[PDB]
Design a protein around this ligand. Structure first.
Ligand SMILES: [Cu+2]
Ligand SMILES: [Cu+2]
Ligand SMILES: [Zn+2]
Ligand SMILES: [Zn+2]
Lengths: 151, 151
């Protein structure tokens, strides 16, 4: 694919629509999420596109290279580590990310996997504790969706 | 991918979970769907895994070979044509299909696309009007879900 889309939904008020487009050797990720508390929220691709138990069955971050958790600009990062999205006072986050590790085809393809928006900011692997290097201490999964092929 | 899963949801009471597993050179589709009216309901893979407008944005049937609609056993069929599932008196349909056209990888991959359960029976391309040759007259989309990679 060259284009994908994901609709985020959960058990609370958080919702959003994320679009993905292959451009050169990168993926451009755009869209918006609403109903979020003001501030930063971790935003990652989780391994499985399994929504049988809500966002919990999505598994851990997509990490085909068996690395520790980092920020998007780090060399030591999971392929699914896209950092944080920032919600304004009205709870709206505008997403505008360009990333070279995720892909819409081949081995790092995220089609069929799960996009998750988390309750807290992702510490990018610099939190000082053990959890920081697994999940960035991003907390719970507020909303998620399976990444599908778009027109 | 060797295993996929899809959770079907819509605006009504219809819901279900379908699993897909590559067993040998074929794909085995299993699961169950509840909340249906008794009888046959068209069950197809629609092209886009786009749920931005409910099941509507899923597009037409997945048809990379550009054929007309037909039954699962016909030569002239869309890849997405999986026939009918049958609901019992209780509104429950058990899915047990093996199909030679869909796949979980490559050109016929259905990962990232949408499974749709329809309101009426699929006439298998033999209804005699133009609509039959497109959708089998299966009618509205009761529930649908994006097919994602499973553990
Ligand atoms: Cu995460
Ligand atoms: Cu259909
Ligand atoms: Zn991570
Ligand atoms: Zn068809």
């Amino acid at each position: 694919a060259t284009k994908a889309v994901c609709v985020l939904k959960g058990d609370g008020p958080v919702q959003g629509t994320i679009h993905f487009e292959a451009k050169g050797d990168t993926v451009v990720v755009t869209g918006s999420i609403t109903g979020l508390t003001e501030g930063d929220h971790g935003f990652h691709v989780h391994q499985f596109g399994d929504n049988t138990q809500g966002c919990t069955s999505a598994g851990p971050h997509f990490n085909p290279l068996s690395k520790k958790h980092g920020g998007p600009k780090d060399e030591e990062r999971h392929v699914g580590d896209l950092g944080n999205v920032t919600a304004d006072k009205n709870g709206v986050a505008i997403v505008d990310i360009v990333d070279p590790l995720i892909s819409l085809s081949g081995e790092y393809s995220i089609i069929g996997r799960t996009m998750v928006v988390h309750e807290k900011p992702d510490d990018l692997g610099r939190g000082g504790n053990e959890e920081s290097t697994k999940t960035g201490n991003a907390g719970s999964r507020l909303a998620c969706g399976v990444i599908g092929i778009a027109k």
